[PDB]
């Protein structure tokens, strides 16, 4: 019943990095619409002194995914990764920007 604060639309990658690098908690994130790949979504996440970027992929059925698990919406992909690491390399959990 309220808009998701993590959806920032078409903001440049550099802009997302500037904003997230200022965040204090690992996991602070946002979903943006990629410029380099029009029509694609990108997930930017604060982690330590860096900002990691993940590309949201879509399968033949139209489901969104990052690695192997599939989702019926960006909304479900995001909520799923609030409890399950968004990265297969390090343990990183999505947290709302503050």
């Amino acid at each position: 019943m309220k808009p998701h604060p993590w959806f920032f639309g078409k903001i440049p990658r550099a802009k997302a990095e500037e904003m997230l690098s200022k965040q204090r908690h690992d996991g602070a994130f946002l979903i943006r619409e990629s410029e380099s790949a029009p029509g694609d979504f990108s997930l930017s996440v604060k982690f330590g002194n860096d900002v990691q970027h993940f590309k949201v992929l879509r399968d033949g059925a139209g489901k969104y995914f990052l690695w192997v698990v599939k989702f019926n919406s960006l909304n479900e992909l995001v909520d799923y990764h609030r409890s399950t690491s968004v990265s297969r390399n390090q343990q990183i959990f999505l947290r709302d920007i503050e």
């Binding site: 990108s42 970027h53 993940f54 590309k55 992929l57 990052l66 690695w67 297969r88």
Partner: peptide
């Protein structure tokens, strides 16, 4: 991208 990390996952790519």
């Amino acid at each position: 991208y990390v996952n790519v």
